[PDB]
Amino acid sequence: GPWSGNAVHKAEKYFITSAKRDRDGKLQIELVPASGRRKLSPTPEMIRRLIDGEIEIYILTTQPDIAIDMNKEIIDMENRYVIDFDKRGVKWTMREIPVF
Amino acid sequence: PVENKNQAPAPGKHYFIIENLCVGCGLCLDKCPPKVNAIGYKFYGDVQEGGFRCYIDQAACISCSACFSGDECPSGALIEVLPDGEVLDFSYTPPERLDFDLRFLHRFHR
Amino acid sequence: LFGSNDVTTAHSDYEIVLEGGSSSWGKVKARAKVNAPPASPLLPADCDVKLNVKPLDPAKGFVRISAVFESIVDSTKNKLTIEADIANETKERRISVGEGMVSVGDFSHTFSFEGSVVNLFYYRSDAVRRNVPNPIYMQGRQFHDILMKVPLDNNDLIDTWEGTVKAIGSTGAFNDWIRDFWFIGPAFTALNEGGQRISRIEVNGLNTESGPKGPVGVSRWRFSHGGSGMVDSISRWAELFPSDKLNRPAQVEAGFRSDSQGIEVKVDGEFPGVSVDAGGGLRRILNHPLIPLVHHGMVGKFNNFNVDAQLKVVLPKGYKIRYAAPQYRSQNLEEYRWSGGAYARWVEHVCKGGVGQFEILYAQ
Amino acid sequence: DVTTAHSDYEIVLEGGSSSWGKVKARAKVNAPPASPLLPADCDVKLNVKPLDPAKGFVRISAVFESIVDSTKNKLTIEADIANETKERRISVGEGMVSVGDFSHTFSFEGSVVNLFYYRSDAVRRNVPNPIYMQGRQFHDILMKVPLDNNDLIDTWEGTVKAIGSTGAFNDWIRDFWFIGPAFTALNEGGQRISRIEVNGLNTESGPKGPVGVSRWRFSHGGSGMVDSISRWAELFPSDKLNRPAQVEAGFRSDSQGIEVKVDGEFPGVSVDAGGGLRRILNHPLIPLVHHGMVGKFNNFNVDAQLKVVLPKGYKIRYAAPQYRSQNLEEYRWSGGAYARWVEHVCKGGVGQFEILYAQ
Amino acid sequence: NDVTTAHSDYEIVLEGGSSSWGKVKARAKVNAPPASPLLPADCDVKLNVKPLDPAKGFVRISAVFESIVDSTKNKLTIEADIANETKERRISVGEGMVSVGDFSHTFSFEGSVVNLFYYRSDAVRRNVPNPIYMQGRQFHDILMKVPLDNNDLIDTWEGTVKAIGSTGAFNDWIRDFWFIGPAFTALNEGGQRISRIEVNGLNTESGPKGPVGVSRWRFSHGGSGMVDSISRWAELFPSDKLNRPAQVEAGFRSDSQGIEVKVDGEFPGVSVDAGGGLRRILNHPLIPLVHHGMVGKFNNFNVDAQLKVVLPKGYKIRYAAPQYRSQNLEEYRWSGGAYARWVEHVCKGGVGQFEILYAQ
Ligand code: BCL
Ligand code: BCL
Ligand code: BCL
Ligand code: BCL
Ligand code: BCL
Ligand code: BCL
Ligand code: BCL
Ligand code: BCL
Ligand code: SF4
Ligand code: SF4
């Protein structure tokens, strides 16, 4: 179980690259697993996996913010973004360079 | 009859760190050359509750890749972005496997 | 002294629990651990196969099968789920209506299919069935008329559909070269190595229809699967389909895990067609289909191995074993266990693809 | 225990005036057979008598008495065969099958035109020993089968109905033609058989009632691995035949093992590879591959010996792995390398064993 | 005396940087008899590639097959210019000479190979990180000219003229002629299906010193994914990666006692970026594996194999399957164990993968 795949992640960690908001919304939002060999698209089957809990997609910070107000605009702590508006999504924070 | 000659001796970059995932162990600091000093501790609160994390100064950090190639991160916060944009928690993650156990009926493990 | 050293080892266990009376039901539990490397170009391949089946109302038949394949290959997750009602219209024809879905990694597509399979032996001679006790080889041919409809919700489906529409009209050799596409891997080799021949498909006209639940590509095509005689899908049409034996639901939870150091196979199953009645009041475990053996022969001859194989036929109290060649090693009052010696030789024979017989005849 | 195959081989050669040879082979292997029907006890007797060598017509009598799954089936053929030309052969004969209780007679008149794809003197001059010679064989066979049994009549009616419909019947008769893995053996041996051409399916009056007339043609392939096209003149030593030649080969196969007994006195065992050298006939490759597909199925240790008795005054000069023992006039191949070659050919190896003997 | 063992040494010296440009040194010896009715069978093959012009993209390849079989010497030399016009269509212009015994014929050829994959789905390439089984079709169109300077050669051309003009089934039997012997089996064991050819032209124009027979013909190779030529067409031709004249010598000698093989040479394309930042030593082409298994199944053998992958400094192997036994801090060594089982696997025709992933 844990030894299969990356041992840190309970669910498959799918980071979201900065594919965004450059051509009719850029529906081909780039989802990349922790393995990183493949580069998938956000098809409804990936959403089925994500709601199944087997995978979990995460937004990074140090990049052009990915449709940050067009995907979802809940900004209570700036990290309340959800895809199907009832997702309970989690954002990865990186104040890498802006902090001392 | 005739054959040709043979010889055969065989026989006889822009690395980032996710502070949400980072736990503040600082092996990146040990893996960084002292002349650069890219890895640095940032303190948030009580040390025993996670407290300080680590950060990279992008301008100072110039494509050494020692941190990630060392593969010393326990938390997987040390990430590498690629020119095409893929992100790597680890250099080589083990493959995901469909796990289900084996029990022979007549063997002693049944 | 001995030759062919440095052999690997395969440890295998099998159990066939038969059911007494007119019920030909069996419970097959098999385990295998092989230390030989697999023949997978994408080696880390683990597949779990859940084949459920349920008796729908037998007024018209239409037993319902439900197959779920989940395969992780090179850390690529694939899942195929098919639920289909299948019914033997007559002894030669079969008609099915079903739905299903594939899902590889990210791309998934659902299909709704109907299918008329007309299976005809190249000959039905009274003399043959009069003279032979059990014809294992039987020449014949299947004709599948398959109408499959797929909503083109994904853009990949749309591009592929446009490509296929252009191809079927631009090239008449498509009907041939589609066979080249039809075998994804070494299946083209296994086709001729298994005795199967596949005729050029005859398209009846694939067309798109505007569906409220997404546009649907509806493709109707017929293809002919001829058999040299080794093919279970043709020669054993009477079998392969528990038309009246499904008085109870049945299941299979098979699976394997294959990686650079080994293969791990676990099969649990309940099958209604394990036992076949024979002449003289004898009943036997069904003759092994030869397509499995031959198709396994391609990969079974890649390493030299020694097999430690056990098999337990839990025979019903009302039956006594007969005509067992190889013979049984351990004799219980009702159970019968084959292991070692000649049976081990047979296991090594069929692991490499040898189509040999393991006649086990049980009777009252 | 362990699968160990013991094979005792011996060949005795006449020389000078004859290319004849007497062969005895006793094989016993513990591996199970690859027959879906387990017990198979078959005996084969082939007797070729020179009816007339001047005419070229030699009479081959072939009886195959087999017991498979407690079913006794006996095939028999008698055929006068003659080379009309070096490319075309003509056969006229009669036979019958005796499968179980069913039995049917057939009278066959056939012509086989074995044409080479290419015949180049450049190829003939260099690379002298021709093995992979490709060619096409056009077989045209007319079969007369008396329709007596009502099941037989039903079969005849079924086939004449199947030829009325089923425009692709010629291609699918190939799938019917080969009961089991023989369709795979087509490709394994390299032969590709084309769609047959049925010149005529008809009935004809006769003393035994109607006789089904079946004239049909087909084409045996041209890879070159198959030896029917590569050695067209070698397989048929009509000129070298002057006495009856007899081969009795029988195998008894139980799940416990296979026991083979072969006793064959035949012409054509010695062929002159070059000037002053006589060679044992080169191994046909189609049997090697067709039996290798079966022999690959089980690991085995090998105990093999080969005894060669030459014509008096001849000695072995060149040899694939040399003879293990040599008595005067007797050579014995055994030990390591010969066992390696035997294990090679059991599993389908087409490697050579070039035994050259000279006066 | 009864033991048959295979002794093999392998050395893969990769070079630093994005370009692989690796050197392969392989020695092999096996006591099993060869699967060749003509023995002894000796062969020397020299393949040297030279960058003719980087701006034009033209590369030049010379292959010299020298062989001795049954005390007969055959030599196929061929110099060719390969040029990638498009990612599907590729052109070739070359000249060569086949000398068998006293006979010798020179040939020239213009040739276009158009390789088209059946499925160009973005879904498959998006999901599968390592595409192995890629179906497709290669259309070859070859115009080959040979001086008819020999009477036997003239006879061959004349007989072929009549053969083409007489039989309409010639396009099927020409495959039997071309696939001489076990080759016709191998194409079925490797997923290769060959369509009937089409003879566009068959004519003769005469040069002042002798006649020239010109034959233009097309054929269609068809790969069911297992074929290296189709599935790895891009990995086939690393012309962009080639700036230095690369070359490989390969000689195998086959007496009935044993087979001895030596393959020494450098060439690009050994390692490709598999994604995820790890360079992968290229996947094994499966056609060699199955075609060699065809003859390797014929006998059993003990395995004594040793592979020595020489990484360039600064790079480490992150994945090996099976694992490396020993490491010299730059050289990773696979000797015995599951690597021996994998060597047995591939010798007998196994298509199992050996994932060598290495990175900075
Ligand atoms: C060295 C010899 C070894 C050995 C070495 C190997 C090697 C080497 C390989 C295997 C492989 C396998 N072996 Mg093994 N194996 C040994 C002995 C065993 C034993 C045992 C001890 O009893 C068992 C239980 C097995 C069992 C298995 C399987 C787990 C596996 C093949 C899966 C298969 O069925 O796919 C079924 C596949 C298909 C049906 C093909 C699908 C593709 C084609 C294009 C489509 C076909 C038609 C389609 C399905 C029709 C659908 C529609 C119809 C309506 C139904 N082997 C011996 C001792 N084994 C192989 C494996 O899978 O590796 C990962 C493999 O590579
Ligand atoms: C595999 C060898 C033959 C073959 C032989 C058969 C046979 C035999 C049958 C069909 C049937 C069907 N075939 Mg088919 N068919 C093949 C190739 C194909 C291909 C293709 C690969 O392109 C397609 C699209 C089809 C299409 C179809 C459908 C029209 C139809 C119903 C499918 C369905 O219910 O599956 C559902 C999917 C499965 C259940 C997946 C698993 C398949 C395996 C083979 C089942 C093994 C059973 C196991 C040993 C015992 C299970 C016990 C459990 C308790 C259930 N065939 C090849 C040529 N085909 C059926 C029919 O006639 O319908 C009218 C039928 O009876
Ligand atoms: C669409 C496919 C076809 C079909 C194709 C075949 C073929 C072909 C064969 C059978 C065989 C059998 N099938 Mg069926 N069969 C169909 C319909 C059915 C139904 C049903 C009412 O739906 C049932 C319950 C059965 C039940 C059975 C048994 C009578 C018999 C196996 C007995 C044995 O001991 O198995 C014990 C077997 C197991 C322990 C192994 C099971 C292995 C795996 C799980 C299934 C086989 C396929 C392949 C290896 C794996 C998946 C590959 C792809 C992902 C599809 N069939 C459908 C319509 N079936 C086999 C038999 O022996 O025929 C005489 C056989 O070869
Ligand atoms: C594991 C390795 C084992 C081994 C494994 C096996 C196995 C396993 C089997 C055999 C089988 C056989 N083996 Mg063995 N065998 C070993 C060692 C040997 C040795 C030896 C070293 O001395 C010998 C001589 C043999 C010899 C034999 C044969 C007696 C037998 C196959 C009969 C045959 O000719 O059918 C030839 C039959 C054909 C030609 C039939 C063709 C059918 C088709 C449909 C008809 C097409 C048309 C027809 C050809 C046309 C002819 C036209 C006329 C020319 C006019 N084995 C090694 C050590 N062997 C088989 C056996 O005995 O079966 C019961 C078998 O399954
Ligand atoms: C085997 C490869 C080829 C083949 C190659 C040849 C060759 C070569 C010859 C024929 C010949 C004949 N072929 Mg044919 N033929 C094949 C398959 C067929 C089939 C079929 C059902 O597939 C048919 C209908 C025929 C029809 C016929 C007949 C018209 C004719 C005489 C047969 C005979 O007397 O057999 C009787 C059968 C027996 C004697 C048993 C034969 C066993 C083996 C194959 C040969 C004997 C040698 C044996 C190894 C050692 C014994 C030595 C003894 C002294 C004989 N062939 C396949 C496709 N055929 C002959 C001819 O040209 O006729 C005009 C001929 O010379
Ligand atoms: C081998 C499997 C396929 C095949 C696949 C390919 C591939 C792959 C290529 C060609 C190409 C060519 N093909 Mg082709 N082709 C085959 C059969 C044929 C036949 C025939 C009747 O047998 C003919 C006439 C041709 C004709 C031709 C030419 C038009 C052209 C250049 C040949 C040349 O320079 O060779 C010179 C001779 C050789 C170099 C001899 C050795 C060949 C082997 C295959 C090389 C392997 C290299 C080794 C693994 C690594 C070497 C490192 C070295 C440093 C280079 N092909 C079969 C069916 N064909 C090329 C092209 O597209 O041209 C436009 C090309 O890329
Ligand atoms: C032991 C072998 C491994 C394995 C090893 C490999 C290897 C190695 C390769 C692939 C490749 C592929 N495999 Mg895989 N893969 C396995 C299991 C699966 C399963 C699954 C059971 O869930 C699926 C869906 C797939 C799917 C795929 C694709 C991602 C890809 C081929 C693309 C293509 O052109 O296909 C087209 C395929 C078809 C034309 C064949 C026909 C499809 C099926 C059989 C049709 C019948 C379906 C159904 C049962 C019928 C009834 C319903 C009908 C609607 C009537 N694999 C098993 C476990 N796979 C290749 C790759 O990625 O290529 C880039 C590759 O190199
Ligand atoms: C005319 C031939 C074709 C062609 C056909 C093929 C085929 C087919 C294959 C390769 C393969 C390879 N080729 Mg190439 N290739 C062509 C052009 C080139 C050029 C170039 C710029 O000219 C270069 C540098 C290469 C380089 C390469 C490598 C990237 C790769 C082998 C990797 C390895 O480690 O091999 C290890 C090295 C070897 C084992 C050395 C082999 C040396 C011998 C002398 C050549 C092979 C002989 C073969 C077995 C028999 C041929 C007999 C025929 C009758 C001619 N190719 C030309 C245009 N090449 C393989 C690969 O993986 O492709 C992706 C592959 O499958
Ligand atoms: S990449 Fe180099 S500079 Fe940047 S943190 Fe690592 S060691 Fe320091
Ligand atoms: S190694 Fe990982 S946990 Fe430790 S300081 Fe670096 S990023 Fe944080």
Swiss-Prot record, chain A:
Q: Does this entry carry the keyword Cell membrane?
A: no
Query: Key word Magnesium present in the record?
Result: no
Q: Which UniProt keywords apply?
A: Electron transport, Photosynthesis, Reaction center, Transport
Q: Which domain of life is it from?
A: Bacteria
Q: Set out the biological process GO terms recorded for this chain's protein.
A: photosynthesis
Query: Quaternary form?
Result: Component of the P840 reaction center.
Q: What name appears for this protein in its UniProt entry?
A: P840 reaction center 17 kDa protein
Record the organism: Chlorobaculum tepidum (strain ATCC 49652 / DSM 12025 / NBRC 103806 / TLS)
Boundaries of the shown chain within the full protein: 21 to 120 of 143
UniProtKB/Swiss-Prot annotation, chain D:
Highest taxon above the source species: Bacteria
What disulfide bonds does the UniProt entry report for this chain? Answer: none
Report if keyword Electron transport is assigned: yes
- Which amino acids does the record list as binding bacteriochlorophyll a 4? H283
Residues annotated for bacteriochlorophyll a 1 binding in this entry: H104
- The positions making up the signal sequence are none
Q: Which molecular-function annotations from GO does this UniProt entry contain?
A: bacteriochlorophyll binding; metal ion binding
Q: Which InterPro entries match?
A: BChl_A, Chl_A_sf
Binding sites annotated in the UniProt record for bacteriochlorophyll a 3? H291
Q: Which UniProt keywords apply?
A: Bacteriochlorophyll, Chlorophyll, Chromophore, Electron transport, Magnesium, Metal-binding, Photosynthesis, Reaction center, Transport
| Residue numbers binding bacteriochlorophyll a 7 | H290
Annotated bacteriochlorophyll a 6 binding lies at: H139
Q: Name one GO biological process term.
A: photosynthesis
Subunit field text: Homotrimer. Each subunit contains 7 molecules of bacteriochlorophyll a.
Tell me the function of this protein.
Intermediary in the transfer of excitation energy from the chlorophyll to the reaction centers.
How is this protein named in the record?
Answer: Bacteriochlorophyll a protein
The species is Chlorobaculum tepidum (strain ATCC 49652 / DSM 12025 / NBRC 103806 / TLS)
What gene codes for this chain?
Answer: fmoA
From Swiss-Prot, chain E:
Q: Does the keyword Transmembrane apply?
A: no
Name of this protein: Bacteriochlorophyll a protein
MF terms in GO: bacteriochlorophyll binding; metal ion binding
Q: How does it assemble?
A: Homotrimer. Each subunit contains 7 molecules of bacteriochlorophyll a.
Q: What is the lineage of its organism?
A: Bacteria, Pseudomonadati, Chlorobiota, Chlorobiia, Chlorobiales
**Which species is the source of this protein?**
Chlorobaculum tepidum (strain ATCC 49652 / DSM 12025 / NBRC 103806 / TLS) (Chlorobium tepidum)
Keyword field:
Bacteriochlorophyll, Chlorophyll, Chromophore, Electron transport, Magnesium, Metal-binding, Photosynthesis, Reaction center, Transport
> Which residues are recorded as binding bacteriochlorophyll a 4?
H284
Q: Which Pfam families match?
A: BChl_A
Binding of bacteriochlorophyll a 1, residues: H105
Positions with a binding annotation for bacteriochlorophyll a 3: H292
For bacteriochlorophyll a 7, which residues are the binding ones? H291
- Disulfide feature: none
